[PDB]
Amino acid sequence: PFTLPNLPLSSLSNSRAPLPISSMGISPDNVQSVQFQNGRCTLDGRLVGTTPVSLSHVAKIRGTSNGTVINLTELDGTPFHPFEGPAPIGFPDLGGCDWHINMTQFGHSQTQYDVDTTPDTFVPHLGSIQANGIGSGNYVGVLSWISPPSHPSGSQVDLWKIPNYGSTEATHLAPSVYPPGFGEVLVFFMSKMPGPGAYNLPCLLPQEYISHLASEQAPGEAALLHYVDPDTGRNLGEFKAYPDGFLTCVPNGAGPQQLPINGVFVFVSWVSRFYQLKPV
Known part of the structure; x- marks a missing residue:
């Protein structure tokens, strides 16, 4: 039943x-x-x-920053391609707001990531979003607070x-x-x-x-x-x-x-x- x-x-x-x-x-x-x-x-x-x-x-992100942009992968770390969806699984779906996500690493001792999901640079659907200051390295991120x-x-x-x-x-x-x-x-x-x-x-x-x-x-x-x-x-x-x-x-x-x-x-x-x- x-x-x-x-x-x-x-x-x-x-x-x-x-x-x-x-x-x-x-x-x-x-x-x-x-x-x-x-x-x-x-x-x-x-x-x-x-x-x-x-x-x-839920509401997390994974990727590597080259200093100017962040390429995305599944939380898993496995490749994410456009045909799969609007963004990797678990990606934050909160519109109408700016994001501030806690970014941490595996093997390194965190960094607030301020995300404006508005520019042409925010293209999670193609696995790439603006690395607004997030230095180079692989990161794990969770939405923490909005504005x-x-x-x-x-x-x-x-x-x-x-x-x-x-x-x-x-x-x-x-x-x-x-x-x-x-x-x-x-x-x-x-x-x-x-x-x-x-x-x-x-x-x-x-x-x-x-x-x-x-x-x-x-x-x-x-x-x-x-x-x-x-x-x-x-x-x-x-x-x-x-x-x-x-x-x-x-x-x-x-x-x-x-x-x-x-x-x-x-x-x-x-x-x-x-x-x-x-x-x-």
Whole structure:
């Protein structure tokens, strides 16, 4: 029988960053569809985009700086070529912001790497990004803290966005995720990302939800889920999981931000895609 981890969201991690999930949320009105590259997984077990199985590959980078540019490899160190994807597996998919990643080495005793994902020099899709000061050597890097994007100009952090991966155009992005509609809204798992702001990082799935799905490769139009409270067992609400790997729910007016996070999504049964959900 289909399953989801019998684990509170409050003890799970974001899938776009190695961060504990602090809550659920809904996207703003100027956010229609979403095209996150990490944290993409079908209920089939199929990983999508640059999404890795483990939280340990999430939002990291590997490569060698020649002093002016950094050529990328898989976290593994094995070659990465354009045809494979928009960037190496686990590559940071946070758009609308500047990056500051901790760079360390194997065999050498760290260096902040300030990344502006805006110039023509940021071409992770061709395995090469600006080595903005990072000296020569091979490095391991993890996103640590973000800041406003330096060029949209005077712009604020917008994590619903994806960074520009090429230019060069056909980077092979995973498809966009659209709300099924009929009042249903996309559910996002939020996490607090360090930086001089009140940054909330959404994602369609908790990192462990993906490993469980990838493993529990069980072969349904839509999954009717119950957000249940562990100890009492009371059904805190109804939800629907879709094949492409995301959850919906109908807000009980102008939703999920109101529910506690120590709850667990339980698979009740498979249902019709147009199954009218009870307000939350």
